Design an enzyme around this catalytic site. Structure first.
Site, PDB file in Angstrom:
ATOM      1  N   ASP A  50       0.726  -1.278   0.000  1.00 30.64           N
ATOM      2  CA  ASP A  50       0.000   0.000   0.000  1.00 30.64           C
ATOM      3  C   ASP A  50       0.765   1.349   0.000  1.00 30.64           C
ATOM      4  OD1 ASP A  50      -2.176  -1.675  -0.218  1.00 30.64           O
ATOM      5  OD2 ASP A  50      -2.720  -1.559   1.908  1.00 30.64           O
ATOM      6  N   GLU A 162      -9.737  -2.356   2.503  1.00 31.23           N
ATOM      7  CA  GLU A 162      -9.669  -2.238   3.972  1.00 31.23           C
ATOM      8  C   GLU A 162     -10.750  -1.302   4.467  1.00 31.23           C
ATOM      9  OE1 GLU A 162      -6.029   0.711   4.993  1.00 31.23           O
ATOM     10  OE2 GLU A 162      -5.370  -1.383   4.764  1.00 31.23           O
TER      11      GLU A 162
END
Ligand SMILES: Nc1ncnc2c1ncn2[C@@H]1O[C@H](COP(=O)(O)O)[C@@H](O)[C@H]1O
Ligand SMILES: [Mg+2]
Lengths: 271, 246
Positions: A50, A162
């Site tokens: 990420d 997420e």
């Protein structure tokens, strides 16, 4: 439908053009900066997928602003808690990103100062999960202190895979100024890293938060109970097994307070 | 009119019923904790007006829930950095539990490491923000260990100006004072029978604007500027799919 609704709210595209997504995202970072009058960005680089994608995007943006006669810089910060087990992935990442500046801030002494005091003030020791949350929030402070001394905006690595599971720490990694990855699923992010020419170790490794001393490097999939492919099939509108839907939809409903501003009596979302 | 729009968005009423306001706000608190299944509340107490009001409201919600046969507790926490008014307010509020977590050594450790890693000393403004953000961590650490929700004292007069630290004192789970102006908060305090010493541009000027009173263009222009500039503080982090920042 709940699947269709979560896709709208999380801004998920069922199909993307990597080249075009990269374009839009760097352009967003550019527009944001110019409107605010900031001097650039700062982001904690962990060696995980990420922050690698988000860091490279901030670097490309900063380079584009300067190419246009602009003024902007990017500080990438390693925020280890003592020695990071996967420290080498963190360096392989710095090597792909190629940030204007690479700083370091060890959060260990601040987290120790805090837990010592906690035990002294209350008589009880912080559980491993709670100290883990003190680590993410300390990283947020470290990031905001730098941005505050140098006039830079803090970047967030939040994305759809997420956002749906509310798998982040409120005011820890969840606290930031702007989010360049919003609405991207996990398999789509890897696809942007592939376009960018990222080294495979960086997107092939298992995602982890690593906030536990008791169990470091514990993968997200161990915590969550579903794999990122199942989460991605759902975010992308694929028809999935009832067991995936039921599961995601419940975790999503119970984590709405993480995707909202503090609750007031005038808010319905929680009612 | 920006005045009306701001008033609408900050949920301010031109006139309030202090007694009904207390009930609705306490009911809001009870209902929220019951919906989440949390065990109570945690508020850092400063002696200041705002934390005093929110604390008494938290205490009253906790007692009400206990009288209905349920279970809830309120932990008032003083967070000094290394107090007469905090103590006077603790006697007015009367919480179930009164804790204390001195932030000094955490702020110091961070400071020395900062200087050590960067070569720079944190300036006064930045170090003040580290103190606000460290208080946030202490409150969430207590709430996370005890299964309690963190109360915030953000009210309308504090929201127009964006006078607060993002993730510092701004970081809370719920806000009981939302929609209230400073002088309306004072009314509530008197109603609750709080000691004068606790609730005692121009702060009364910011209230006039918020309550819809004819203000001068000077006050008007300053506030609307401040407000549009602090939008990022009343919003979730920005993305390309948002436009309030444009
Ligand atoms: N060890 C670390 N060093 C630097 N930054 C980190 C580190 N761990 C977490 N962060 C930051 O918090 C974010 C969360 O990563 P993850 O928890 O794997 O989503 C990363 O993208 C980083 O920006
Ligand atoms: Mg990780």
């Amino acid at each position: 439908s709940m699947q269709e609704k979560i896709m709208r709210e999380l801004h998920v595209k069922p199909s993307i053009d990597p080249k075009q997504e990269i374009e839009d995202r760097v352009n967003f970072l550019k527009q944001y900066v110019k409107k605010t009058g900031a001097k650039g960005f700062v982001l904690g680089i962990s060696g995980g997928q990420d922050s690698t994608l988000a860091g490279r995007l901030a670097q490309l943006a900063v380079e584009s602003i300067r190419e246009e006669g602009g003024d902007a810089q990017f500080i990438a910060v390693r925020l280890p808690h003592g020695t990071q087990q996967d420290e080498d992935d963190a360096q392989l990442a710095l090597k792909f990103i190629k940030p204007d500046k690479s700083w370091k801030f060890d959060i260990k002494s601040t987290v120790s100062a805090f837990s010592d005091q906690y035990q002294q003030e209350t008589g009880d020791q912080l559980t491993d999960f709670n100290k883990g949350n003190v680590k993410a929030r300390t990283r947020m402070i470290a990031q905001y202190a730098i941005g505050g001394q140098e006039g830079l905006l803090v970047l967030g690595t939040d994305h759809a895979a997420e956002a749906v599971t509310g798998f982040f720490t409120k005011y820890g990694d969840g606290g930031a100024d702007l989010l360049p990855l919003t609405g991207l699923t996990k398999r789509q992010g890897r696809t942007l890293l592939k376009e960018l020419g990222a080294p495979e170790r960086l997107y092939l490794k298992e995602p982890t938060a690593d906030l536990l001393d008791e169990k470091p490097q514990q993968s997200d999939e161990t915590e969550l109970g579903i794999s990122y492919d199942e989460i991605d099939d759902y975010l992308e509108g694929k028809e999935v097994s009832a067991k995936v839907s039921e599961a995601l939809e419940k975790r999503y409903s119970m984590t709405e307070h993480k995707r909202q501003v503090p609750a007031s009596m005038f808010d319905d979302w929680w009612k």
